[PDB]
Amino acid sequence: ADTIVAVELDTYPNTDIGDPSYPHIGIDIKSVRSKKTAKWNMQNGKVGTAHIIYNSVDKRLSAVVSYPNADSATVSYDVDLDNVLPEWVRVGLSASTGLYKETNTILSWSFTSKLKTNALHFMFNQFSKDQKDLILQGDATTGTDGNLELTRVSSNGSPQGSSVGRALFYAPVHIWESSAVVASFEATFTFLIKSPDSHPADGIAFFISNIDSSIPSGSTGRLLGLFPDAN
Amino acid sequence: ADTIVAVELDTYPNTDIGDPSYPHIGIDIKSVRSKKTAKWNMQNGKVGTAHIIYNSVDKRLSAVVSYPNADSATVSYDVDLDNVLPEWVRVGLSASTGLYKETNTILSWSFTSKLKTNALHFMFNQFSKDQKDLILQGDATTGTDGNLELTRVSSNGSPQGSSVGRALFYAPVHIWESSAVVASFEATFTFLIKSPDSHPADGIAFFISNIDSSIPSGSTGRLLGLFPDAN
Amino acid sequence: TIVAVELDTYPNTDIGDPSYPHIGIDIKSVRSKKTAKWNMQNGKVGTAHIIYNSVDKRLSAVVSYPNADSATVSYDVDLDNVLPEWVRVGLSASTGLYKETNTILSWSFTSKLKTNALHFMFNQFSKDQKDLILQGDATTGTDGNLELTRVSSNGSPQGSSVGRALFYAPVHIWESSAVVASFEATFTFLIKSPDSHPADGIAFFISNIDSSIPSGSTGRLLGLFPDAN
Amino acid sequence: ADTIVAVELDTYPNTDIGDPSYPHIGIDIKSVRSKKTAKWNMQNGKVGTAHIIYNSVDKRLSAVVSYPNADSATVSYDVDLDNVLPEWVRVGLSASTGLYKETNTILSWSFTSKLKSETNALHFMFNQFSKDQKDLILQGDATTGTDGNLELTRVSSNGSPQGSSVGRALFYAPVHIWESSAVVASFEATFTFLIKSPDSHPADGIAFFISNIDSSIPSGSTGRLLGLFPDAN
Ligand SMILES: OC[C@H]1O[C@H](O)[C@@H](O)[C@@H](O)[C@@H]1O
Ligand SMILES: [Ca+2]
Ligand SMILES: [Ca+2]
Ligand SMILES: [Ca+2]
Ligand SMILES: [Ca+2]
Ligand SMILES: [Mn+2]
Ligand SMILES: [Mn+2]
Ligand SMILES: [Mn+2]
Numbered sequence: 001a002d003t004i005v006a007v008e009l010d011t012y013p014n015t016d017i018g019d020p021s022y023p024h025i026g027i028d029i030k031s032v033r034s035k036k037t038a039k040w041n042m043q044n045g046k047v048g049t050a051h052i053i054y055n056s057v058d059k060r061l062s063a064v065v066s067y068p069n070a071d072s073a074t075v076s077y078d079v080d081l082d083n084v085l086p087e088w089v090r091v092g093l094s095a096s097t098g099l100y101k102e103t104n105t106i107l108s109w110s111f112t113s114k115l116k117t118n119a120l121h122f123m124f125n126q127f128s129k130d131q132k133d134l135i136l137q138g139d140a141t142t143g144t145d146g147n148l149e150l151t152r153v154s155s156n157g158s159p160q161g162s163s164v165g166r167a168l169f170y171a172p173v174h175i176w177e178s179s180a181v182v183a184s185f186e187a188t189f190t191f192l193i194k195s196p197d198s199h200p201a202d203g204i205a206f207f208i209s210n211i212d213s214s215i216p217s218g219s220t221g222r223l224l225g226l227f228p229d230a231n
Numbered sequence: 232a233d234t235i236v237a238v239e240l241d242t243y244p245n246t247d248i249g250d251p252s253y254p255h256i257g258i259d260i261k262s263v264r265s266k267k268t269a270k271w272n273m274q275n276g277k278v279g280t281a282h283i284i285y286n287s288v289d290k291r292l293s294a295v296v297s298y299p300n301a302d303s304a305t306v307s308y309d310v311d312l313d314n315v316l317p318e319w320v321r322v323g324l325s326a327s328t329g330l331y332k333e334t335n336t337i338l339s340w341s342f343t344s345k346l347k348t349n350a351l352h353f354m355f356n357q358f359s360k361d362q363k364d365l366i367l368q369g370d371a372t373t374g375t376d377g378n379l380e381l382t383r384v385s386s387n388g389s390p391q392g393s394s395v396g397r398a399l400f401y402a403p404v405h406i407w408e409s410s411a412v413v414a415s416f417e418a419t420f421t422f423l424i425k426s427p428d429s430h431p432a433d434g435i436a437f438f439i440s441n442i443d444s445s446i447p448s449g450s451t452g453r454l455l456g457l458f459p460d461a462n
Numbered sequence: 463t464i465v466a467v468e469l470d471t472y473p474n475t476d477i478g479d480p481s482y483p484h485i486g487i488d489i490k491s492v493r494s495k496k497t498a499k500w501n502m503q504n505g506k507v508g509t510a511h512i513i514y515n516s517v518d519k520r521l522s523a524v525v526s527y528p529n530a531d532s533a534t535v536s537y538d539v540d541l542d543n544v545l546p547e548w549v550r551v552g553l554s555a556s557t558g559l560y561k562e563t564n565t566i567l568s569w570s571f572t573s574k575l576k577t578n579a580l581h582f583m584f585n586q587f588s589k590d591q592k593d594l595i596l597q598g599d600a601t602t603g604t605d606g607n608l609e610l611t612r613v614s615s616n617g618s619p620q621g622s623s624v625g626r627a628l629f630y631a632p633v634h635i636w637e638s639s640a641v642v643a644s645f646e647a648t649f650t651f652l653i654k655s656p657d658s659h660p661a662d663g664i665a666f667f668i669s670n671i672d673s674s675i676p677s678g679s680t681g682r683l684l685g686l687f688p689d690a691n
Numbered sequence: 692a693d694t695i696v697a698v699e700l701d702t703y704p705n706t707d708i709g710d711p712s713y714p715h716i717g718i719d720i721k722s723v724r725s726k727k728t729a730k731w732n733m734q735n736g737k738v739g740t741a742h743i744i745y746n747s748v749d750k751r752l753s754a755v756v757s758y759p760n761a762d763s764a765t766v767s768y769d770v771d772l773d774n775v776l777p778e779w780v781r782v783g784l785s786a787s788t789g790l791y792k793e794t795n796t797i798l799s800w801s802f803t804s805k806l807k808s809e810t811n812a813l814h815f816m817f818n819q820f821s822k823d824q825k826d827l828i829l830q831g832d833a834t835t836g837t838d839g840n841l842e843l844t845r846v847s848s849n850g851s852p853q854g855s856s857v858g859r860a861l862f863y864a865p866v867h868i869w870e871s872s873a874v875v876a877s878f879e880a881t882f883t884f885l886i887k888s889p890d891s892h893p894a895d896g897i898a899f900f901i902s903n904i905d906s907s908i909p910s911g912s913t914g915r916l917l918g919l920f921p922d923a924n
Contacts, residue, residue: 121352631864
């Protein structure tokens with residue numbers, strides 16, 4: 001029953017539910033089946049950066065994911081978020097593992113949202129063990145090497161399967177308003193995805209939800225902690 | 232029992248509880264009896280600005296209150312907030328009326344905090360009828376002309392006695408941390424205090440509190456919605 | 463070499479303006495690559511907001527007044543192919559046979575590349591504003607405002623004026639190795655006339671770091687263009 | 692002569708001109724002889740961060756310098772900049788070497804200044820310095836681009852630092868640092884740096900400075916004078 005808009009960094013192609021047949025970034029409007037995707041050369045054990053932008057003038061959600069010294073992956077999609085989301089939302093990071101797995105480690109996260117001005121800005125370049133400005137859901141924890149581990153990792157530092165977790169910014173965010181002339185947001189995060197396997201799964205997403213969003217039961221694996229099913 | 236740090240814009244001298252005998256600005260560290268005050272030439276019905284700053288290097292809380300084309304009032308007090316406040320806090324605006332009254336209208340409020348870097352910034356230049364990133368307490372309301380009315384005003388614009396209200400930012404703020412090299416915050420608000428009669432009361436404060444802080448029982452009047460008694 | 467967003471108050475149909483006040487995106491020519499109709503409000507304070515990023519490669523602008531519907535215009539353009547890597551940014555305005563005040567009450571700009579950034583904000587302009595280059599008739603400090611074109615002691619705008627203000631620091635507007643490049647500008651303006659016939663308009667622009675007012679660019683050319691091609 | 696206000700990270704103790712006998716950070720108001728200093732445990736080859744703050748309410752120039760996992764050094768001095776500097780300035784980083792030497796490598800530099808009277812502001816941030824960085828004025832031996840860093844003083848192709856070098860980098864736009872009619876004025880600066888040396892007592896240091904707009908390196912200002920002062924008065 002939640003409403004979700006997300007940008008997904010999908011490490012595991014589930015072609016049975018529409019993923020293209022490679023690792024990819026996508027834009028998800030109310031479904032795990034991305035409205036748009038682009039090919040992504042995920043680099044195991046390397047630190048990448050994701051950058052998500054939107055404004056109400058162009059009505060265009062874009063994302064760029066990059067690693068140092070590599071060509072970046074970019075995806076864009078036309079959508080007026082006033083038609084999808086409620087006026088007030090929470091914003092968050094989600095990740096999952098399944099039969100296959102990976103660390104879903106978040107090293108930094110920033111966000112800015114403006115409504116013309118009213119503004120909200122936060123930045124985490126370090127997460128503490130007791131991060132009262134985050135709502136941690138599922139298996140997500142903070143504080144180990146000052147990072148946000150969205151899914152379960154053991155002490156020896158090895159990722160566990162079938163895990164799901166999220167972190168939402170505590171304050172509601174006014175993401176759109178009819179009376180506003182311009183609304184915009186941007187989000188940045190740095191992430192470290194490492195697998196012992198060879199086959200990493202399942203991904204990390206930046207998402208925007210109704211304020212009371214919770215992890216749907218069963219949303220491990222291909223469902224990214226975002227959706228109750230694959231419709 | 233709440234922990235409070237506040238900067239008060241005190242319109243009504245209660246000489247019997249240690250107010251000086253003129254309107255004043257004050258720094259309150261866990262007591263309504265200001266640790267330092269300065270004379271404040273309040274201007275009934277004009278828009279004022281208050282600016283509050285602190286950093287962990289100087290460990291000095293200062294405040295400056297001004298009106299266009301008038302001399303500003305400044306107060307400062309040396310205090311190590313590390314030994315006063317909890318590590319995580321909420322920030323807020325509070326006001327009250329008693330036997331005597333006034334409007335306690337907030338036209339704008341911004342805050343920035345930094346911990347080295349993690350950061351939180353917000354800015355309100357307009358308040359809406361349903362401002363979900365604020366916790367309104369007591370008599371506080373939003374949406375009347377796009378402003379925050381901290382105390383009761385009638386439909387005819389006139390302020391009411393025996394009122395108390397507060398507005399806190401929804402997200403906790405990490406105000407200090409021992410591992411941190413430098414911590415700083417600042418806050419700015421613009422306010423409009425009108426009274427029909429001579430003699431307005433009781434005042435406006437910017438405050439910092441334990442996360443779960445609430446209006447103390449009985450704290451209309453002299454206690455500014457901050458303190459349970461006049462100790 | 464000019465990219466600009468014009469707030470065109472005077473229809474010059476002679477050279478391809480539409481028959482109504484318009485906003486437009488100008489890429490190297492006063493003949494806008496895209497326009498939109500604009501219900502300019504004579505003597506009210508307006509706001510212009512301009513945005514571009516290198517992911518979308520879309521230059522967009524919105525102009526509005528309180529309690530009025532806004533005007534918006536966009537144009538796809540890759541600034542990598544139109545501007546040098548380093549530029550200056552500014553505001554320009556003109557009058558000719560008709561006239562208007564071209565008063566700037568505020569101006570802010572942010573640019574970002576990858577992370578390198580520049581931000582500035584003027585809400586008040588001073589008599590001797592050393593981080594601006596004033597060109598032509600532009601002056602600062604009267605009531606704390608920037609007057610891009612001539613105004614008399616009592617406030618009457620003068621015909622045949624041109625003036626501009628550029629931020630003193632060069633701006634790094636694109637770099638081929640950047641992941642994301644972006645800018646935004648916002649200004650608030652007061653364009654007033656003693657009749658209808660107000661002219662000629664205000665523009666936010668991006669040029670070469672040595673750009674000066676081209677010769678004979680009063681009027682229709684908004685202080686931006688050497689000819690009407 | 693130029694008017695200079697500076698926060699110095701002084702690696703070399705020139706006790707004959709008033710340095711304490713240890714590496715130190717200090718506040719310099721028109722003289723290389725600091726108004727105030729604190730001991731600084733400089734760490735050869737580690738990346739350090741410096742943070743400089745000032746506001747016109749408290750009128751106290753403070754600085755904190757630090758390294759990961761070490762205690763930071765801090766220094767503060769009460770001084771009203773309105774009395775010392777002209778109203779418009781440029782801001783800069785300077786460094787020098789002498790008989791002894793060190794890399795004076797700047798990896799990042801950010802600055803913000805604000806004035807009220809509803810505010811004017813200027814912010815810049817460099818996390819990368821490019822070969823041809825037109826919003827910087829480079830003076831003396833200073834160069835940009837090598838590994839995207841700003842090298843204030845001369846380093847050989849094999850990365851070894853040279854003695855007797857001086858260089859500076861100033862932001863191109865003038866800064867409105869104070870104004871008569873301002874309710875509050877403030878600035879902060881942050882930079883990260885790498886000082887590596889072969890020698891046992893590295894020299895001479897790095898400084899964040901604020902100067903007249905037309906400031907240039909004074910004659911004879913290598914070594915202990917940090918590219919900032921014509922002499923040791
Ligand atoms: O983990 C990879 C893959 O494994 C299984 O098939 C499920 O858990 C999917 O939901 C997931 O995509
Ligand atoms: Ca998948
Ligand atoms: Ca009182
Ligand atoms: Ca025209
Ligand atoms: Ca020395
Ligand atoms: Mn997918
Ligand atoms: Mn009092
Ligand atoms: Mn010294």
